[PDB]
Amino acid sequence: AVQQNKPTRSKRGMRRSHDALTAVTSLSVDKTSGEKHLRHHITADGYYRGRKVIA
Amino acid sequence: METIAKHRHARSSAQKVRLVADLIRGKKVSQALDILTYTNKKAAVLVKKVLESAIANAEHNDGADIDDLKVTKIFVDEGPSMKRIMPRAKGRADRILKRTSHITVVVSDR
Amino acid sequence: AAKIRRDDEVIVLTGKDKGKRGKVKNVLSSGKVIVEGINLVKKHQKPVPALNQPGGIVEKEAAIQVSNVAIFNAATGKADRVGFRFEDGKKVRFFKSNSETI
RNA sequence: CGAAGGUGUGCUGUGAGGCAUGCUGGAGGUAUCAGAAGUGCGAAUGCUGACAUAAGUAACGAUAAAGCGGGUGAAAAGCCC
RNA sequence: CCCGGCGAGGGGAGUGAAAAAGAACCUGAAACCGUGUACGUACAAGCAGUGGGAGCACGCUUAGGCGUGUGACUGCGUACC
Secondary structure, three states: OOOOOOOOHHHHHHHHOOOOOOOOOOOEEOOOOOOEEOOOOOOOOOEEOOEEOOO | OEEEEEEEEEOOOHHHHHHHHOOOOOOEHHHHHHHHHOOOOOHHHHHHHHHHHHHHHHHHHHOOOHHHOEEEEEEEEEOOOEEEEEEOOOOOEEEEEEOOEEEEEEEEOO | OOOOOOOOEEEEOOOOOOOOEEEEEEEOOOOEEEEOOOOEEEEEEOOEOOOOEOOEEEEEEOOEEHHHEEEEEOOOOEEEOEEEEEOOOOEEEEEOOOOOEO
8 A cells, every 4th residue: 555645744744743852851969979870870980879889 | 252063974864863963952061961971872972072072172272161152053964875776576676875964063152 | 499498597577476587497398497486385295204304384496387488688688589590510599689699 | 347157136018028236156258230040848658867755664584592701992792712 | 283083074274366166176056955033823624826904023214105024814716738
């Protein structure tokens, strides 16, 4: 099955009106090192909730 | 004062790069870097490199201050396409397009 | 034969160096000459570790069209034209303003 | 002291059209009256090149199968031990 | 000289009459794809225009008008070969 008429750029945009991405609302700050990280994740230096976990 | 940076002939589709470009339009540079660091897309790496280059140009060639800069313009345009061949069943051949784009970032202190 | 030869004194007829004087250094096959102190250009030279040569911006001479220079006549202080004739058994050049051998 | 060509504005004839000028371009153009034609395109499932739509959709080629530690590197599910 | 992987790509300085003449290099049309500004659009039914016509934004102004853009609401109206 295939189309009988060619769709328009207006219709293309209307369909694409649901494709926008979402950004992270905010980041968290560790209590000993001051780094920024994703909530419930460890930091790039190896801290979580004030304690060094990974050397 | 305004400062430009560009990446020409980048290996990606403009439709795919515009999704990431729409996230940082009109933001402060620090906020924009924080937004780009936590987006799980391939276009984010390219856009981040271009933004960093623009900040460096503004510091070195114009004597600007980092804490006053904002992303005043950003856009993506289509480049040339490469043409390739892919075989199908019963001896029929198809065409493949490999698309590219140009990326422009403008930072300003006003 | 040729009217302009190496080691001659010439005056420039056209260009940005119009009116200057100099000496011919060498003659190229395409119809061009190199004259000392005339038609200078600036070149951006890349360095090369071999040959112990560094880079920099250098000033050198560039070739100029042969028909844009003339032969200088010190007796008159003016440009001139050149002709050919046989004198003893040999060919010679001569000035056309006063019919004097060069 | 700015030709052809490109792109806007104003005026003008019943029409095919004409004239003037701003920006771009960087060396050619041609009155009047006569003369000769490869002389005017939207269609021919016309011919050649470029670019759209369907769509960021189908698919990534045998259902023998992978897990972990170290190394290198800007980056390692796939490279080396 | 500077950002970047001793990258691809870019921003300055310098050459030249000119670098949107930078090697993907005279001029640079159209299809097609974007960023910004003004006005319209979420109780409304069809070849998408034509006649009538408020409201908003903007430029002259002889303060009397007019020009340009958009166009709620309403009569008529089923492409071309």
